[PDB]
Amino acid sequence: PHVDMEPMTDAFLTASVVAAVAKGGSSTSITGIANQRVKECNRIEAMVTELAKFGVPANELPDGIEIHGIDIEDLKTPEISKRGVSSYDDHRVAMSFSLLAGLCKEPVLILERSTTGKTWPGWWDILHSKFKIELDGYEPP
Amino acid sequence: SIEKVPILGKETIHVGYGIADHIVREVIANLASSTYVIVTDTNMARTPQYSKLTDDFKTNLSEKRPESRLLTYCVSPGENNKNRATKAAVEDFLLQQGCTRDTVILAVGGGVIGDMIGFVAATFMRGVRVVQVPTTLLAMVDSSVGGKTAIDTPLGKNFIGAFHQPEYVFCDVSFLETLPARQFINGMAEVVKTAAIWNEEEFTRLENFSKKFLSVVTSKKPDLQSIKAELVKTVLESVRVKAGVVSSDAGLRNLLNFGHTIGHAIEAVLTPEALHGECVSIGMIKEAELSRYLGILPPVAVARLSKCLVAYGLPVSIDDKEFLKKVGPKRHYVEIDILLKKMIRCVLLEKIGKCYQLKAHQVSKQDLSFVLTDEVLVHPFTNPPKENIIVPPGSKSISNRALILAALG
Amino acid sequence: SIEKVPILGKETIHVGYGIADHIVREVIANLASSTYVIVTDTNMARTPQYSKLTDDFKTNLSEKRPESRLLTYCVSPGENNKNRATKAAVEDFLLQQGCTRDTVILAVGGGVIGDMIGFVAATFMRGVRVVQVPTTLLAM
């Protein structure tokens, strides 16, 4: 229903991408995350746009984000449609949406992969050997 | 005064700074002949250090063998001046100067000379003797040792040649004061390729060497006195690593292509403006990336390997601050599709100084497509491990404290 | 039907009249490869006996190794045509036809072919394999 995070602010994007697949009548309305804009950018608005690119509604609350959950799977909006997952060169956005990306039928591309070098420069390395998942790469001309 | 590295059971690679007396005293005394040919570069011919060598080859033969000659050729420099037509020039020069199956062809040059003149000696009179005297830091550790000789077909670089072992390979370290700083840093890539597949102790000295090697080379006249001893030590454990592998043979020699798979595709499109150690240095980090991708390499190794290369000034990526200026408008000729098909075995690095099972493993195109790009395409999760331990970066908070407390205790 | 003369400890010189079945049955079976090159003379190429050999090399590949090729060159015969420029022709023909380090270069020719094509195989890709099929009594 509702969770506050005063000390756990560097856990929101993780909490949002698992709240994106938690389905039910009540929606996850996390709050008290006002300091997350001044890290590098307004990442509150980021979750609004990208979760609309997976097909799950995510409105913007005055101090947080209310997250719906449709199913465990989502809508079909791959790289053949419009654009992929913008990461804005931040490590939080790339590693969080990579958890969500493996639930569709087709592979979900994530732009700007190697910006995770600030905290975990080998996240994608863990995902293939030590999690047994495929990963490819794409280059637009 | 002189170190000596064995190759194929014979101690013929001679290493030392300022060994110009020992160059001339060793070949006319141990390798007796009638005609002695010194083929070199024209910009090398005007060097003052080359006059120290030939005039010590001139006046010292009237002592030791007065009925013997001295012929000299001078081929013009450049990459495009190593081809089947300028091979035919010394293939015509020897025959019309009355040479036989007795010739000693001193190839005092770089990698372009030791590749071409050694192929001449592999074909002149069905095989004659060759004494490699390499001069650049790349050729002292790569192309002189091994006897791999070829020329440039326009359809393909380094394809048509023959196997002919040298008789003596002299590592004349005093021939490096005339080398440009860009060509000199380009050789220090292949000392790291030898100090990261077979040696680890040398690599520990290289980080202590990377500081004042760079302050003495980027200074436009490289005053190399009072640092002779660590410069001669640098090329020691590059050849010892190499000649320890070329004696073992194609089996184990494929471990010397660590980076020569990705760094030969980057060389294939960025050829005549980016050098050879410039692109192998990118191929080192990209292959250290692939071995980290398959759960083989610790992530502290790439943080140390990319430290040593960027301290030397070699590029660590294709979009790096100096590699963009040198390559310039050719940078946009690096696409993922053309790079990948011309690459697929790789030397997967286990740790710094050791190879994974001492062999060459075949990797798929998909992980090779992954490590070169900054774009990830995430597949549907079909099978995670049910038991799976995951160790994230260690807690920096306790770490910083533990070192203070331990130091005080 | 076939005599066999040892050379350097291996019994590889095969002698016999009309051995055209044994030429093709021995090299694709014992010397396995992917590309097979038959370099010959042009006046030898129009001979009826050479059509007995290549067509027995063509149709007998599809039963023993169907994923292997057959390339053919024809250099004009003569000592004047055995030089460093016409050596460069098959030194360019192999590289632009997609040949690797495992080529088998059948030098069906005389003394001018076995001297030149064998030098190509001594230099092509740092040494590849060559099967001499000499035709004149001098070169045999």
Give the pairing type, strands C129-134 and C104-109: parallel
- Sign, CA dihedral B308-B311-B317-B323, equals negative
Cβ of B337 under 8 Å from any chain A Cβ?
yes
C3-140: CATH topology: Rossmann fold (3.40.50)
Q: Residue B103: CB partners within 8 Å, gap ≥ 6?
A: B33, B35, B36, B37, B94, B121, B124, B125, B128, B129
Cβ of B340 under 8 Å from any chain A Cβ?
no
Neighbours of chain A (3+ CB pairs under 8 A): B
> How remote is the C-alpha of B149 from its chain's centroid?
14
Task: Identify all chain C residues contacting B163, using CB atoms and an 8 Å cutoff.
Answer: 126-127
Among B153, B156, B162, the residue with its CB nearest the CB of C126 is B162
Helix and strand element counts for chain A (H, E): 4, 5
| In chain B, ranges of CATH 1.20.1090.10 domains | 193-372
Query: How many Å apart are CA C110 and CA B97, to the nearest integer?
Result: 32
Query: How many Å apart are CA B216 and CA B225, to the nearest integer?
Result: 10
What are the distances in angstroms from CA B407 to CA B400, B402, B403, C129?
A: 11, 8, 6, 67
Among A107, A112, A120, the residue with its CB nearest the CB of B378 is A107
Measured between CA atoms, the residue of chain A closest to residue B299 is: A122
Q: Which residue in the block uniquely carries the two structure tokens 């690096």?
A: B334
The DSSP annotation for B224-259 comes to -TT-HHHHHHHHHHHHHHHHHHHTT--TTGGGGGSS
Q: Which residue in the block uniquely carries the two structure tokens 């990209």?
A: B286
Task: Identify all chain B residues contacting C122, using CB atoms and an 8 Å cutoff.
Answer: 162
Q: Residue B232: CB partners within 8 Å, gap ≥ 6?
A: B3, B15, B16, B17, B171, B173
Query: How many Å apart are CA B130 and CA B103, to the nearest integer?
Result: 8
Beta bridge partners of B72: B38
Query: How many Å apart are CA C83 and CA C119, to the nearest integer?
Result: 11
Judged by 3 or more CB pairs under 8 A, whether B touches A is yes
Q: Which residue in the block uniquely carries the two structure tokens 């141990």?
A: B30
Measured between CA atoms, the residue of chain A closest to residue B367 is: A136
Query: How many Å apart are CA B61 and CA B321, to the nearest integer?
Result: 52
Task: Identify all chain B residues contacting C94, using CB atoms and an 8 Å cutoff.
Answer: none
Q: Which of A85, A90, A91 is nearest to A110 (CA)?
A: A85
Task: Give the CA angle between residues B206, B210, B211 to the nearest 5°.
Answer: 135
Q: Residue C91: CB partners within 8 Å, gap ≥ 6?
A: B84, B153, B160, C120, C123, C124
Q: Which residue in the block uniquely carries the two structure tokens 């080529």?
A: C103
Side chain identity at B390, as an amino acid letter?
Answer: I
Among B155, B160, B163, the residue with its CB nearest the CB of C124 is B160
Q: Residue B388: CB partners within 8 Å, gap ≥ 6?
A: A130, A131
Cβ of B379 under 8 Å from any chain A Cβ?
yes
Task: Give the CA angle between residues C41, C43, C45 to the nearest 5°.
Answer: 65
Q: Which residue in the block uniquely carries the two structure tokens 């790289």?
A: A79
Task: Identify all chain B residues contacting C126, using CB atoms and an 8 Å cutoff.
Answer: 148, 150, 161-163
B193-372: CATH topology: Dehydroquinate synthase-like, alpha domain (1.20.1090)
State both tokens at B405: 């407390």
Contact status, residue A30 vs residue A6, Cβ threshold 8 Å: no
Give the pairing type, strands B148-153 and B156-163: antiparallel
Beta bridge partners of B15: B3, B171
Alpha carbons within 13 angstroms on the beta-carbon side of residue C138 total 7
Measured between CA atoms, the residue of chain B closest to residue A121 is: B299
The b/e string for B113-151 (b: 16+ C-beta within 10 A; e otherwise) is bbbbbbbbbbbbeeebbbbbbbbbbbbbbbbbbbbbbbb
CB-CB under 8 Å, B160 with C123? yes
Task: Identify all chain A residues contacting B390, using CB atoms and an 8 Å cutoff.
Answer: 126, 130
Query: How many Å apart are CA B91 and CA B125, to the nearest integer?
Result: 10
Query: How many Å apart are CA B214 and CA B136, to the nearest integer?
Result: 17
Task: Identify all chain B residues contacting C88, using CB atoms and an 8 Å cutoff.
Answer: 84
- Exposed, middle or buried, B273 (CB in 10 Å: 0-12/13-18/19+)? exposed
State both tokens at B178: 């005339």
Q: What share of chain B is helix, strand, coil (3-state, %, to 5)?
A: 50, 15, 35
State both tokens at C125: 């890709």
CB-CB under 8 Å, B153 with C127? no
Beta bridge partners of C13: C5
- What is the DSSP code (8-state) at residue B142? T
Q: Is B264 a catalytic residue?
A: yes
**Is C87 one of the annotated binding-site residues?**
no
Q: Which of B137, B133, B113, B87 is nearest to B275 (CA)?
A: B137
Contact status, residue A132 vs residue A126, Cβ threshold 8 Å: no
Contact status, residue B95 vs residue B128, Cβ threshold 8 Å: no
Q: Which of C64, C48, C61 is nearest to C106 (CA)?
A: C61
Cβ of B95 under 8 Å from any chain A Cβ?
no
The Cα of B366 is separated from the nearest Cα of chain A by a number of Å equal to: 6
What resolution (Å)? 4.2
**B99 in helix, strand or coil?**
coil
- Exposed, middle or buried, C14 (CB in 10 Å: 0-12/13-18/19+)? middle
Q: What number of C-beta contacts closer than 8 Å exist between A and B?
A: 106
Query: How many Å apart are CA B54 and CA B39, to the nearest integer?
Result: 11
State both tokens at B328: 């310039």
Please give the helix or strand (H or E) that residue B350 lies within, else none: strand B349-351
Q: Which of A137, A141, A102 is nearest to B374 (CA)?
A: A137
Q: How many CB atoms lie under 10 A from the CB of residue C112?
A: 19
First to last CA, chain A: 45
> How remote is the C-alpha of B138 from its chain's centroid?
4
| In chain B, ranges of CATH 3.40.50.1970 domains | 3-192
- Exposed, middle or buried, C7 (CB in 10 Å: 0-12/13-18/19+)? exposed
What are the distances in angstroms from CA B395 to CA B304, B398, C43?
A: 20, 6, 81
> How remote is the C-alpha of B60 from its chain's centroid?
33
CB-CB under 8 Å, B374 with A115? yes
State both tokens at B217: 């080379």
State both tokens at B403: 């070192």
Helix axes B299-312, B201-217, angle to 10 degrees: 30
Query: How many Å apart are CA B81 and CA B390, to the nearest integer?
Result: 55
Measured between CA atoms, the residue of chain A closest to residue B332 is: A141
Query: How many Å apart are CA C91 and CA C125, to the nearest integer?
Result: 10
| Domain B3-192 classification at class level | alpha beta
Catalytic residue among B264, B332, B361, B379: B264
Helix axes A43-54, A91-100, angle to 10 degrees: 20
Contact status, residue B188 vs residue B150, Cβ threshold 8 Å: no
Binding site residues of B, as ranges? 41-43, 79-82, 110-112, 115, 126, 135-136, 142, 148, 157-158, 175-178, 186, 190-193, 242, 253-257, 260, 276
Which residue intervals of B313-348 are DSSP H helices? Answer: 323-327, 336-341
- Sign, CA dihedral B85-B90-B91-B93, equals positive
State both tokens at C138: 């001098």
Query: How many Å apart are CA C132 and CA C140, to the nearest integer?
Result: 10
Q: What is the 3-state secondary structure (H, E, C) of B250-272?
A: CCCHHHHHCCCCHHHHHHHHCCC
Contact status, residue B51 vs residue B84, Cβ threshold 8 Å: no
Query: How many Å apart are CA B187 and CA B194, to the nearest integer?
Result: 11
- What is the DSSP code (8-state) at residue A35? G
Query: How many Å apart are CA B36 and CA B23, to the nearest integer?
Result: 13
Determination technique for this entry: cryo-EM
Among A104, A121, A129, the residue with its CB nearest the CB of B295 is A129
What are the distances in angstroms from CA C43 to CA B263, C17, C109?
A: 47, 21, 10
Contact status, residue B190 vs residue B197, Cβ threshold 8 Å: no
**B146 in helix, strand or coil?**
coil
The Cα of C121 is separated from the nearest Cα of chain B by a number of Å equal to: 10
Q: Which residue in the block uniquely carries the two structure tokens 């050791």?
A: B354
Backbone angles phi, psi at B50, to 5 degrees: -75, -25
What are the distances in angstroms from CA C85 to CA B88, C75, C91?
A: 11, 12, 9
State both tokens at A115: 């910006």
State both tokens at A98: 């990579």
Tell me which of C123, C124, C125, C128 to substitute to probe the interface with B (most B C-beta atoms closer than 10 Å). Answer: C123
> How remote is the C-alpha of B323 from its chain's centroid?
19
Query: How many Å apart are CA B304 and CA B285, to the nearest integer?
Result: 10
Q: What is the maximum alpha-carbon separation in chain C?
A: 41
- Exposed, middle or buried, B339 (CB in 10 Å: 0-12/13-18/19+)? buried
Query: How many Å apart are CA B318 and CA B324, to the nearest integer?
Result: 8
